Amino acid sequence: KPRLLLFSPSVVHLGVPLSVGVQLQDVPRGQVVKGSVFLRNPSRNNVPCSPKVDFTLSSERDFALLSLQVPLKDAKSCGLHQLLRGPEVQLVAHSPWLKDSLSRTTNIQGINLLFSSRRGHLFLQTDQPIYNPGQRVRYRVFALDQKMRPSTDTITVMVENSHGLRVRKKEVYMPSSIFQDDFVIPDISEPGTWKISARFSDGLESNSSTQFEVKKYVLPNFEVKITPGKPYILTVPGHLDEMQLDIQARYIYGKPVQGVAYVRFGLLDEDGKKTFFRGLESQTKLVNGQSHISLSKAEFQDALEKLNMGITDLQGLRLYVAAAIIESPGGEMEEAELTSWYFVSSPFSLDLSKTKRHLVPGAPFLLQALVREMSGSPASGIPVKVSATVSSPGSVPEVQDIQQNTDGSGQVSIPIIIPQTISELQLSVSAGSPHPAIARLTVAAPPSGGPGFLSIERPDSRPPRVGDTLNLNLRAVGSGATFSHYYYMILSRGQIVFMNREPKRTLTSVSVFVDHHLAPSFYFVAFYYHGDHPVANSLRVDVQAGACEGKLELSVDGAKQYRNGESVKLHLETDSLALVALGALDTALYAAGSKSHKPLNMGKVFEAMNSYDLGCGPGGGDSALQVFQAAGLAFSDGDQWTLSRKRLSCP
Amino acid sequence: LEILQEEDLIDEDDIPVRSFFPENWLWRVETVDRFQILTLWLPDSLTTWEIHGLSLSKTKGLCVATPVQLRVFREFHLHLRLPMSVRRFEQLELRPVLYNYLDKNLTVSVHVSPVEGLCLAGGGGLAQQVLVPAGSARPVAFSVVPTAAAAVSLKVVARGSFEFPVGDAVSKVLQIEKEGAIHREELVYELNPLDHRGRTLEIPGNSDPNMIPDGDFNSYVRVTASDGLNVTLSSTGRNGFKSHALQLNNRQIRGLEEELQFSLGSKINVKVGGNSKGTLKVLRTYNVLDMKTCQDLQIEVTVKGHVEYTMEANEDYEDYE
Amino acid sequence: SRVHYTVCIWRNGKVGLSGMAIADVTLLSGFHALRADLEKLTSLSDRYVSHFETEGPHVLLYFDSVPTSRECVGFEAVQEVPVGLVQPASATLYDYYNPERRCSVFYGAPSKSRLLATLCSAEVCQCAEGKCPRQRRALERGLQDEDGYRMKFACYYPRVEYGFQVKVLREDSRAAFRLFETKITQVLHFTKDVKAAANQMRNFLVRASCRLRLEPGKEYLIMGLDGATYDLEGHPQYLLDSNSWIEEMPSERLCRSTRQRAACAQLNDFLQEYGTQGCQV
Amino acid sequence: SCPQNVNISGGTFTLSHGWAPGSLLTYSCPQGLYPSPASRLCKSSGQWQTPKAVCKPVRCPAPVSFENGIYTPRLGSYPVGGNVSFECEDGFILRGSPVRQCRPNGMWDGETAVCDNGAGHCPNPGISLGAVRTGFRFGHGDKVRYRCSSNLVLTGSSERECQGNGVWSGTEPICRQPYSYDFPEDVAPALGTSFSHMLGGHLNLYLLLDCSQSVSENDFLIFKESASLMVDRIFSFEINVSVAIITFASEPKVLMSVLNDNSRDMTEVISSLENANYKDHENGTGTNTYAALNSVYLMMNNQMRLLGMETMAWQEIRHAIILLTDGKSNMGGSPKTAVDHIREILNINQKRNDYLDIYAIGVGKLDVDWRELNELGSKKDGERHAFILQDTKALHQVFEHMLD
Numbered sequence A: 001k002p003r004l005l006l007f008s009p010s011v012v013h014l015g016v017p018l019s020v021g022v023q024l025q026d027v028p029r030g031q032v033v034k035g036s037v038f039l040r041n042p043s044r045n046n047v048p049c050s051p052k053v054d055f056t057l058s059s060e061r062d063f064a065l066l067s068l069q070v071p072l073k074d075a076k077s078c079g080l081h082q083l084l085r086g087p088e089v090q091l092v093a094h095s096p097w098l099k100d101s102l103s104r105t106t107n108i109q110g111i112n113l114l115f116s117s118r119r120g121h122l123f124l125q126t127d128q129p130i131y132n133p134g135q136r137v138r139y140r141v142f143a144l145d146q147k148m149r150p151s152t153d154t155i156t157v158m159v160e161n162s163h164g165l166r167v168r169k170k171e172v173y174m175p176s177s178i179f180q181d182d183f184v185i186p187d188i189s190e191p192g193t194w195k196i197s198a199r200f201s202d203g204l205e206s207n208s209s210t211q212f213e214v215k216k217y218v219l220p221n222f223e224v225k226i227t228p229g230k231p232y233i234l235t236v237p238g239h240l241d242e243m244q245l246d247i248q249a250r251y252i253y254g255k256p257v258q259g260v261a262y263v264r265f266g267l268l269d270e271d272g273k274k275t276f277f278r279g280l281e282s283q284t285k286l287v288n289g290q291s292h293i294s295l296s297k298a299e300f301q302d303a304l305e306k307l308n309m310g311i312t313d314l315q316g317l318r319l320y321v322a323a324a325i326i327e328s329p330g331g332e333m334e335e336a337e338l339t340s341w342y343f344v345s346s347p348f349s350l351d352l353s354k355t356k357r358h359l360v361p362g363a364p365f366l367l368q369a370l371v372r373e374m375s376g377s378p379a380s381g382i383p384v385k386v387s388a389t390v391s392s393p394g395s396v397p398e399v400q401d402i403q404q405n406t407d408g409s410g411q412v413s414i415p416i417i418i419p420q421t422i423s424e425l426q427l428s429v430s431a432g433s434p435h436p437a438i439a440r441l442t443v444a445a446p447p448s449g450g451p452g453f454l455s456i457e458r459p460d461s462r463p464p465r466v467g468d469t470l471n472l473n474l475r476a477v478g479s480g481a482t483f484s485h486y487y488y489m490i491l492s493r494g495q496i497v498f499m500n501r502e503p504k505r506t507l508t509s510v511s512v513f514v515d516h517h518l519a520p521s522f523y524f525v526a527f528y529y530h531g532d533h534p535v536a537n538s539l540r541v542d543v544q545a546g547a548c549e550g551k552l553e554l555s556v557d558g559a560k561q562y563r564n565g566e567s568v569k570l571h572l573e574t575d576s577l578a579l580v581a582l583g584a585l586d587t588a589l590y591a592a593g594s595k596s597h598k599p600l601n602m603g604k605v606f607e608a609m610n611s612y613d614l615g616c617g618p619g620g621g622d623s624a625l626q627v628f629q630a631a632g633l634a635f636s637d638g639d640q641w642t643l644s645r646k647r648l649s650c651p
Numbered sequence B: 001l002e003i004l005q006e007e008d009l010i011d012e013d014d015i016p017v018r019s020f021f022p023e024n025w026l027w028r029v030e031t032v033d034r035f036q037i038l039t040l041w042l043p044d045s046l047t048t049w050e051i052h053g054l055s056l057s058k059t060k061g062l063c064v065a066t067p068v069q070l071r072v073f074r075e076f077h078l079h080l081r082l083p084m085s086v087r088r089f090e091q092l093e094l095r096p097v098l099y100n101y102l103d104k105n106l107t108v109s110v111h112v113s114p115v116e117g118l119c120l121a122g123g124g125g126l127a128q129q130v131l132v133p134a135g136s137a138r139p140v141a142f143s144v145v146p147t148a149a150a151a152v153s154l155k156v157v158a159r160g161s162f163e164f165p166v167g168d169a170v171s172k173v174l175q176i177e178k179e180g181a182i183h184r185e186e187l188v189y190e191l192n193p194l195d196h197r198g199r200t201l202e203i204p205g206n207s208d209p210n211m212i213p214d215g216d217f218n219s220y221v222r223v224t225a226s227d228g229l230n231v232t233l234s235s236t237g238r239n240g241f242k243s244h245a246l247q248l249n250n251r252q253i254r255g256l257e258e259e260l261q262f263s264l265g266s267k268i269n270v271k272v273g274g275n276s277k278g279t280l281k282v283l284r285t286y287n288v289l290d291m292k293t294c295q296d297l298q299i300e301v302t303v304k305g306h307v308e309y310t311m312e313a314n315e316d317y318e319d320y321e
Numbered sequence C: 001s002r003v004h005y006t007v008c009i010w011r012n013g014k015v016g017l018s019g020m021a022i023a024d025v026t027l028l029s030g031f032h033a034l035r036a037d038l039e040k041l042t043s044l045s046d047r048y049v050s051h052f053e054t055e056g057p058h059v060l061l062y063f064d065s066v067p068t069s070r071e072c073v074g075f076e077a078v079q080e081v082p083v084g085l086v087q088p089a090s091a092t093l094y095d096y097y098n099p100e101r102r103c104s105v106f107y108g109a110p111s112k113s114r115l116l117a118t119l120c121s122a123e124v125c126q127c128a129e130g131k132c133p134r135q136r137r138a139l140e141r142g143l144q145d146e147d148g149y150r151m152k153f154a155c156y157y158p159r160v161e162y163g164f165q166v167k168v169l170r171e172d173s174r175a176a177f178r179l180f181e182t183k184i185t186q187v188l189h190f191t192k193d194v195k196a197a198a199n200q201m202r203n204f205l206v207r208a209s210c211r212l213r214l215e216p217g218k219e220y221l222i223m224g225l226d227g228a229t230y231d232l233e234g235h236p237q238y239l240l241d242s243n244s245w246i247e248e249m250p251s252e253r254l255c256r257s258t259r260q261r262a263a264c265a266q267l268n269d270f271l272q273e274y275g276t277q278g279c280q281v
Numbered sequence D: 001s002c003p004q005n006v007n008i009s010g011g012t013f014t015l016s017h018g019w020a021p022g023s024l025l026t027y028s029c030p031q032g033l034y035p036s037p038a039s040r041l042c043k044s045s046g047q048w049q050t051p052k053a054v055c056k057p058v059r060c061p062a063p064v065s066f067e068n069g070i071y072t073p074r075l076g077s078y079p080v081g082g083n084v085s086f087e088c089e090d091g092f093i094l095r096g097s098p099v100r101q102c103r104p105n106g107m108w109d110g111e112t113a114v115c116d117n118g119a120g121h122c123p124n125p126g127i128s129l130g131a132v133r134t135g136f137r138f139g140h141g142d143k144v145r146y147r148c149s150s151n152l153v154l155t156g157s158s159e160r161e162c163q164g165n166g167v168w169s170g171t172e173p174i175c176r177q178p179y180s181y182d183f184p185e186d187v188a189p190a191l192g193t194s195f196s197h198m199l200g201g202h203l204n205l206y207l208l209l210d211c212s213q214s215v216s217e218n219d220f221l222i223f224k225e226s227a228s229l230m231v232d233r234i235f236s237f238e239i240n241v242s243v244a245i246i247t248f249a250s251e252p253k254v255l256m257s258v259l260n261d262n263s264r265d266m267t268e269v270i271s272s273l274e275n276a277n278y279k280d281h282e283n284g285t286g287t288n289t290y291a292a293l294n295s296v297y298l299m300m301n302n303q304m305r306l307l308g309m310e311t312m313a314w315q316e317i318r319h320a321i322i323l324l325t326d327g328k329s330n331m332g333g334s335p336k337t338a339v340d341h342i343r344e345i346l347n348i349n350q351k352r353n354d355y356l357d358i359y360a361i362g363v364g365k366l367d368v369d370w371r372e373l374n375e376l377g378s379k380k381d382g383e384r385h386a387f388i389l390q391d392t393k394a395l396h397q398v399f400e401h402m403l404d
């Protein structure tokens, strides 16, 4: 009857603290326990790999979060570096309570974990996106720990050329967490995309890299952009929407380009092979930097006929538009290419990845969809129709029809009601009209006769902001109220950050304070115990409106209309002493580049936060072990323990 | 018949030349104590500068600021774009373009400052007369046969009339590549250190008849780590005896194919080690005389008529000396 | 006034081409094409170009069919300002589908040359662009020497670093220059070419566009600035341009004529004093 | 006669033979300005011939390029009295004067600004203001080629090679303007340092004096005076030296030789120098610098023969040549040819380069050519050998304080 619970992330990262959750159950009120938890050897040999940390838990305090440290010296000495086959390790909890109470053969309870040397966040940016051969290349890397604080650990950068051969390598100490460096591209180097990689010296797998392009080019004077009238082409048999483009050419310093535009059309497939339309080439004189050309109906039909292609065959193809504008009388040539144009059967796209699977019977099913305009920003105010067909629970199936428009940014939350003893649920989601986007998903049901169920209801479907408190409702379903409390934890960046206990009540609430470090996605895992069988449910919550912990603001005094050689009073504003890194880039580099490389912004940093997340889907599971595995934890209660994850990817 | 203005122009000395054209600037890293003002001096390039920004602080983590677009515009300038490739003794046609964005007709005398190493038209002293209508642009064609064989500074200058005091001057260093074209001589040698016969190998010295004097001889070694080579390349050289040792495997395997610049005149030797199936590719580059108007396209412009020169470019007897 | 252009186009490779091609000819410095001629050109059924656009010194023509043979078409332009300096222009022909498959052609003025004349020999060569040699005639015209005009030209400006009296063996034309192979009668002065001596060959070259004539079998006095061409044989080879003094030597009879005694005698007096004594400065 | 409308704005002018045909008009402007045109010719009674006249301001060269750094303010050509500041990016340590002020002579002050990271085998030679450099690799055995810009003339080394000892071969090039000259105060320490390297054994010193028509009788007198103080000072150091006096013209004349043993006596050399006159050079008034250098070479060969091929007594013999000329070599060929003979016979290499220094002190303001003086003078790192002084007063001034 008494039990000891062991909670820990499925993957342990070397050199950074590990959070271990420990818990009791059904223990006498006056009873207390003693013990220590430590990482043991992968059992190929037997040497402890971490210092022992004590825990003192009782009836009134039956939970505690232990910050178990895993120093690199102990990991190297005990034999993790000498391991064979895969990278596993064992975490066990040692306490005489097991033998004293449960009369177990051993006083050791543990889990199987994967150990990876990846740690810290490494960011690095180069001088320019594109360079000429024989041109000096400058770059710098930033070293940051788990909490993105500046890190002083030594790092080993390297440079790989276009062919992939290493060209440079520097093992550099970190006094200021920034390492500036420069090198010269060989004058005989062929065009290609070079790569600069940076790793922590003791972290083998912590390689963060950036890429820059090398090409024989000269700086352009103006850039040409081709913007389609609509980023989609409707190819439904009933009608085909007109194809129209607005070709613009403007001098980079602002003024429009005067010249002519040479437009060549063609069909481009997914592989990349482009078949040009012989004929229909349009040449126009740019009037106010712009030329508005369009493809007619009969012209396009004849073009398809010449290639012996049908409208119904245009599935997945792309209408390829290329331009080569000649400045007049300047004579300069600049080329623009269009490849985003896609033949589609519906002007909308449905993303159902947010829809939780394996949902509990007896509680509302939260269908969540993202109505994103095809190759565009999320759409707002677009109706969504879903037909829910509850499969036979013993009677005839029933069809439930709910309609709800998109509140904003494509977010639609449709709480369909699921009856008890449901065999399986079939959903058919349709959004937009006419020519809707059809998305179909089917979900099974948990096995009948289970020990119970837990439901997590989130009244506010809008994503929480930074610093905004989030409250969830927990309700046990399908079992008696033998238990007195349930327990919940919050997972961010693959580490257990919070643990608490809430007493069982009626229509209960659990409040979670969304800290900044919990962004951009944290897992909420809650579970209770019906006798000796665990039942759990994990809800994934994403955090939007990501912003820096501090702030950095650049501003230029006055209007942005200067003259060459004049003075600029650039303004920097922040809230603390910061190693501000600056860089002024000529805009023409973006135009000359074959592929436009977006600069470093908060999106990449927040993705770097999410790169350490161990989550597997939007949460939920048939059993407690499945819920914990999807969340990214390892659970062992002495009788049932989840196996170590087969792969980090969790396909 | 056409009216020409002479020496009533700007003095050419007041016109401010533009010479700083950096692709990127402001690469410094600064410590801001919650407030700092930088007095940046804008370069002479006429584009828009997207000033990036990243913050790294010990207490507030990391932040990336929104880039600031910064625009520089002169409203009348001589934009000049040098050709990507300019070989010595090869005729190129410089194309300075005068963009007149004002609201008045402008008459400008365009000329290239005569410099040693450049064979211009008529010695480089003549100034070409062009007129740029308001809100338009005109190109001026200067034909140059560079005999310098080295980088040289040209300074194209545009001089308006004294009635309308405008003008611009641009001074970019024009790197002259040396005579002939570049040739590549790669040499492939499979590297099996297990076989004792492959332990020591020597690459033959280069004796190329068509190699041009001052052939910028650069050697790069491309050695592949695919299977732990300790290839040590030893070589006597005119400059000196230099040997740099390559350890490609480093007791590790992540795309460790290596490349290192190798500075030799003629001779080269190999000392192999380890156990692997690596490949050595010493790459030699040097100038060569070779040729290729397209073989596919061709074009010919023939002109007939009377063209009036400005009495300073007529190459004939003065008849009274 | 009005100058008639003629842009010609054809293709030979036949492989890798896409047919339609873009013509981009740049007119002379002070010329803009007549739009009437071009619109008449494009209004014809077999116009050979589907589109055109010209502004100032630029003319754009879209050739939608480039065949094997030489088909071509011409238009007429007008002059705005006199051409400031004699120089060829550039005309470029682009490929419609692969503009990187291009090649420009240099076309000269109606009578001038295609490329800048340069006296190129060995592995280093000199800028041949400049002015015509004068071929000064004072004794032949009968004008008496004033203030030592030959001596002033030799010693004051342009100072001469080489001076010889040469007998012209032959007249030949190579590339853009007319080569006069000459034999050294005497070496008056030399800064470079320390190996100058009597009865030695020296190549004197002048641009073919000029009318300078050095009759073979006659002696002339040539002075001027050096050249850096080396003749590819070893001896420095001199070029004739501005700052070069060329005078026809006194013969048995033209110096006999009445007004020419003083002139020919004074030139020979310069000969012996300058060759023997020097600049005296 | 010639027209009298030959006035210059802001300055004066002088004439050689009045307004008669063939007279040479000389233009002069105050310091900080350069005459333009420099001189006019009255022609054969025609209008004045020039190779409106205005004293255009002096303008120092502006930095064409500044590798790995910025320079403020940025101008096309800095005027007199202007300042320029040279600070460069992080990781690069500046060398030379960060602040350089354009002196009225058309030259900056202080060493040329350059910052080097030190990765290269040799120190960064840098881009001198007004010049350009080709080749950004500082490896051992590598080379850099310099080219001037606009109308500047290159004085110094047009090609430098990174030698094994970590010092680039040749001197640091300095693009100069044709009108630019040298102040005595600037050039006295340079001469002192070069002669200090020379004195660091027995030394051979040859003094070459100009006595053509272009140099005047008073000008030659000041030349003789400066030579006399020069030989007086070197004998005051109690160092074994032999000095020879050569005064050259259309045909060179030898007033003293190193073969004679009297060259090691102060009274003998001063008596020989004072006996010099202008009459002996009046019959022939050319400037055959090559002939003078050939006479020096003949002295070299005679000392060779009398001393011996491999005798130590000659191996420790150092040679320093001084030329007080107006830089108008107009006969005998290129003077550089004889310098090639001297270097060949002395077996000049990277090690024996200490045994030969050639000083080419130009004097005058009208017909002094920078290329000739630079070509004659020797080229060594950190030292200047080619000089131009506007007046012989400046020549006497620089010599009388030349040593310390």
Ligand SMILES: *[C@@H]1O[C@H](CO)[C@@H](O)[C@H](O)[C@H]1NC(C)=O
Pocket: A205, A207, A208, A209, B254
């Ligand atoms: C680290 O290196 C591995 C092996 O080359 C590569 O697959 C992986 O993408 C890298 N990780 C990054 C770039 O985050």
Ligand SMILES: *[C@@H]1O[C@H](CO)[C@@H](O)[C@H](O)[C@H]1NC(C)=O
Pocket: B103, B104, B105, B133, B134
């Ligand atoms: C400029 O030239 C145009 C074209 O000849 C003429 O119509 C116009 O009046 C002129 N002046 C202005 C101020 O635009």
Ligand SMILES: *[C@@H]1O[C@H](CO)[C@@H](O)[C@H](O)[C@H]1NC(C)=O
Pocket: B228, B229, B230, B247, B273, B274, B275
């Ligand atoms: C390569 O050189 C290292 C230098 O430490 C040496 O220890 C090693 O044995 C060599 N490589 C192999 C594969 O033996």
Ligand SMILES: [Mg+2]
Pocket: C281, D212, D213, D214, D215, D286, D287, D326, D328
């Ligand atoms: Mg003289």
